[PDB]
Design a protein around this ligand. Structure first.
Ligand SMILES: Nc1nc2c(ncn2[C@@H]2O[C@H](COP(=O)(O)OP(=O)(O)O)[C@@H](O)[C@H]2O)c(=O)[nH]1
Length: 305
């Protein structure tokens, strides 16, 4: 109808971070309540492919093919909510997450915390089994988000252990890609949610370097008390992964088809209308005011995030 295709919301393509006045203009005109889904993860891990499946439209995001490996940004695509009439689904696709283990450039990395704080549901996307690097990566953006939260008006006086925090801050979904691991414990099979809870399991009482072990896991667990995990096989034999989008659905792996259907159905039925601290529903212009408020507080701010 009137909602256009993906556009930059904020990126650093040409020098420094710039907010796209055209993206605010689009948000300003979205009078309907919005459901906001943000996705964060390393370059070319299939983030855009998955967000395009949520939108159910052609000509969606292609960040892995058109953004350079060093750019950071948030890209926005608003569509009618595929399952909730008179609701708009706001898709926030991001790029430029750095690998902390390799000392990747962290300048402007606060925009990934921004994407999380704008979201109804935050999707963290990584390849393979849950390993130390993926955990450390998640821990970094969680600490950054908590820092920005603790120090800005939208998040002020909303302690992580309260019920307001649990209810009105973003739900969390970890998507694991090219995942071939057997979801088994002692011959007995376990779910992907089970796998995630196991990876976040706390050492019970253990203390010398056991309560050091719990610290990053407790940070994640308490910042994201609403958690879900989805696993995705290779989409298709590697031969064909160059341009997955061009493949016909019947040429995908059948388990991948089911795994994408499951993810999409969960997100589109379970992600709530974005809400402020306190429960106030958020619509287009209200989201735009959140963007402005955060960007100004972080720009004008004194301390590092
Ligand atoms: N191996 C693998 N490749 C994928 C998957 N999804 C997409 N790709 C390919 O990975 C590349 C980058 O995709 P894109 O979605 O743009 O990645 P983004 O950077 O994370 O957004 C493309 O060539 C895709 O065809 C996946 O699940 N597994």
């Amino acid at each position: 109808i009137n909602l256009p295709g993906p556009m930059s919301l904020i990126d650093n393509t040409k020098g420094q971070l710039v907010v796209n006045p055209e993206a605010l203009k689009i948000l300003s005109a979205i009078t309907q309540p919005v459901v906001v889904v943000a996705i964060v993860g390393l370059y070319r891990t299939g983030k855009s492919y998955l967000m395009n499946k949520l939108a159910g439209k052609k000509n969606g995001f292609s960040l892995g093919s058109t953004v350079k490996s060093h750019t950071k940004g948030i890209w926005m695509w608003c569509v009618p909510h595929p399952k909730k009439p008179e609701h708009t689904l706001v898709l926030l696709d991001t790029e430029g997450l750095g690998d902390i283990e390799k000392g990747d450039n962290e300048n402007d990395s606060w925009i990934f915390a921004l994407a999380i704080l704008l979201s109804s549901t935050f999707v963290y996307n990584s390849m393979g089994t849950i390993n130390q690097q993926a955990m450390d990566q998640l821990h970094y953006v969680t600490e950054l988000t908590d820092r920005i939260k603790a120090n800005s008006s939208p998040g002020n006086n909303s302690v992580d252990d309260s019920a307001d925090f649990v209810s009105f801050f973003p739900a969390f979904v970890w998507t694991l890609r090219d995942f071939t691991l057997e979801l088994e414990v002692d011959g007995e099979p376990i779910t992907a949610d089970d796998y995630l809870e196991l990876s976040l399991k706390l050492r019970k009482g253990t203390d010398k370097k056991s309560k050091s072990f719990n610290d990053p896991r407790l940070c994640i667990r308490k910042f994201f008390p609403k958690r879900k995990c989805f696993v995705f096989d290779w989409p298709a034999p590697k031969k064909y992964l160059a341009h997955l989008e061009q493949l016909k659905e019947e040429e995908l792996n059948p388990d991948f088809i089911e795994q994408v259907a499951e993810f999409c159905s969960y997100i589109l039925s379970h992600s709530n209308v974005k809400t402020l601290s306190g429960g106030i529903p958020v619509n287009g212009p209200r989201l735009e005011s959140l963007v402005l408020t955060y960007v100004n507080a972080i720009s004008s701010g004194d301390l590092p995030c």
